[PDB]
Structures are given as structure tokens and as C-alpha cells.
Amino acid sequence: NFNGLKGTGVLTESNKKFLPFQQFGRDIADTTDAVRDPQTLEILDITPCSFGGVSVITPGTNTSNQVAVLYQGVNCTEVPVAIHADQLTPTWRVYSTGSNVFQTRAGCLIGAEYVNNSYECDIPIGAGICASYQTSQSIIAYTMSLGAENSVAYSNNSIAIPTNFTISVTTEILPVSMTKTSV
């Protein structure tokens, strides 16, 4: 509550150079995000808490109950600081330092360990990360791979004529109509 400008959020230190008479600082959404303390000319910046949601990466509940959460684009050296509920919540706030925390371009995946060799992938994680439930079973995150780089002996005299074949029969499935409804 600064001069009747109510709200909610944490306060930080700002380097903005307010004019002698200006006091509030707005943004595109016409939301106050920079106020000057009435007590002294110090400039404060108002920021929200840690946000962005959490995208848990779990196999089916038919299989084990192991998880590996994801934080959307947060440098999570600050998630332990933002967490004061470790005693209150079991197996949730403890994830601030769980398995070997890994850092991607889309925030830090927590609860899994990077592996070197590249396979096909199952669960799209983001920014170049997939996972699967393997090894003693745990969560392993890696980088995708269409396959081993097949080197072709390109040459100005080389060609390849197949000498056999196969007649595959694949099934393409197409919808043609939905259910007729009436209200």
C-alpha cells in the first residue's frame, strides 16, 4: 500500500530513473510494475512470485509412481529460495534438490539424469528433449535421433539397382462423418 496504490506481490530493487514528479510505472497492460517509495526516493519494482505452471513427466499409474517435474523457463537456482514449504509438502518441495537437476532451454527438468547415446523418443519434453522409462527403472532424458547418420557413397559413377521387393499393406485411417446431433 503506497499512496493508495494497492496490490499484491513481492518487491525488488529497480534501477529505473523516475522523473522528479513521476511516481508510478505502467506497462502495456496498464499494470503498475514500478513504484517509488513515498518515504524516500528509492525506486521499487513489483514482480510476481515464481510462475509458469509445472508439467509433470510421469509414466502411467499402471506402472510405478515415479515422476519428474518440469519448470517452464526458470533458472532454478531460485526455486529452493522460493520454496519455504519443504516441511509442509512431502515429495514436492524436496524436488528443489532431487535427482541430478538438469537445465534445458525451457527451464530445468528435475528428477532425471542425462544419458549420452541417442535413440528414438517417447515423451516430447521440449527444446530438444525426450524421455522414456528405462534404466532398476528410472527416468532418462536425452536428445532425439532420427537414426544413425547413414553415409552414402556419392560419386559421379555410382548407382544402386534393387534386385528384390516387398508388397507392404499399410492401413491409412480416415474419418468420413461425425455423429448427427440435435439440441
Binding site: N157, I159, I161, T166, S168, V169, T171, I173
Partner: protein, 195 residues
């Protein structure tokens, strides 16, 4: 082998089950969505009339008869969208039933993931399945090429076929089977010089 792949998993028929799933789950939300009060005093409607005077009972029922009136138009709007790609897949289906089955398609990878042979429709719930009989090449062998020749001091090039040799003679083969043949005047024509 087809029947094993059909029973291999539950995702083989995932592109029809989605339609019945996405057009029966829509109903369930539409039924559930009338439990919301929309800021009124109660979800049920007879109690509103039996608890407040007609002078200001119309204020609240107005907020409720507009919430449902817009909770219902949203279902229609999402239904116009969902009927635009089915109309855009009954046109591709009425096309693979129009060229794969009514003849052979010269398109590459349209009626078959590779060179194409035939097609078959099998009627399915709210859809169709095409047993796209397809050709796919198998193992190969190595050869060296020379797209020219000159024998009688002048060019003489074949009617149709490449000049590939294994080490003994240059042979003629088509583009997806090793099928050689010796040089003969029947498949050979003179065309310009050989320099």
C-alpha cells in the same frame, strides 16, 4: 500379417476412435456446464421463482438465461470447425476411392508409400480404412555407369535403358529391377555424333 498389426495395439484405430471420443466428450461437458451458477443464486430454476418476487427475479434469471444461451453457441461454433476437416477428408477419401481404386495413381506416395499397386476400402464406424497395397524395393547391388557409347565412329544410343556394366559388357536395365539385356539394333537408334 495384417490382422496381427490390427491387433498389435490400441492406436491402430486411433484416428476413428478420436472422432467418437471428441464428439461424445463434447456432450458431457455441455451437460456438466449447466451446473454453473453464472453469478445467480442457485443452479436449479424453480426455486428461484418460488423464493423471490417477480419484480427482481428477472434480474437473476437474466444472468442465467444468457450464460446457457452462450454456453450453447460455443458448442455449435466448435461443431462448425469439426465439420470442416471431415469435409476435407471425405474429399481426399472420395479421391483415393477415385484414382487408387478406379485405376492407378501416377502421383508419387499418394496411393502407396512407394510405387503403388492397388487399394481396398473396408467400411468402418464413422470412417474408412484403406488397405493400401504398395510396392517397396528390397536389397540392391553395385554397378558403374556410362550414359553414352560410340561404336561405328558415330553415336548410337538406346531406345530406352541405361548402359551399366559389371565388368564384361555394358548391359541395359530399368529403374527398379536388375534386368539386363545385350545390345541389339531393335532398341538402339543413331543420334548425332559421339564427341
Amino acid at each position: 500379417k495384417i490382422q496381427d498389426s490390427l491387433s498389435s495395439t490400441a492406436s491402430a484405430l486411433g484416428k476413428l476412435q478420436d472422432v467418437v471420443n471428441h464428439n461424445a466428450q463434447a456432450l458431457n461437458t455441455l451437460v456438466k456446464q449447466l451446473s454453473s451458477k453464472f453469478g445467480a443464486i442457485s443452479s436449479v430454476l424453480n426455486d428461484i421463482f418460488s423464493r423471490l418476487d417477480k419484480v427482481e427475479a428477472e434480474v437473476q434469471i437474466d444472468r442465467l438465461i444468457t450464460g446457457r444461451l452462450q454456453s450453447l453457441q460455443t458448442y455449435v461454433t466448435q461443431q462448425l470447425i469439426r465439420a470442416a476437416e471431415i469435409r476435407a477428408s471425405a474429399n481426399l477419401a472420395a479421391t483415393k476411392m477415385s484414382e487408387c481404386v478406379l485405376g492407378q495413381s501416377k502421383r508419387v506416395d499418394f496411393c502407396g508409400k512407394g510405387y503403388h499397386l492397388m487399394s481396398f476400402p473396408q467400411s468402418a464406424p464413422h470412417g474408412v480404412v484403406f488397405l493400401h497395397v504398395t510396392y517397396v524395393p528390397a536389397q540392391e547391388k553395385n554397378f558403374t555407369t556410362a550414359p553414352a557409347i560410340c561404336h561405328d565412329g558415330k553415336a548410337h544410343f538406346p531406345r530406352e535403358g541405361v548402359f551399366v556394366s559389371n565388368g564384361t559388357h555394358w548391359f541395359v536395365t530399368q529403374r527398379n529391377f536388375y534386368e539386363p539385356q545385350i545390345i541389339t539394333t531393335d532398341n538402339t537408334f543413331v543420334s548425332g555424333n559421339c564427341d
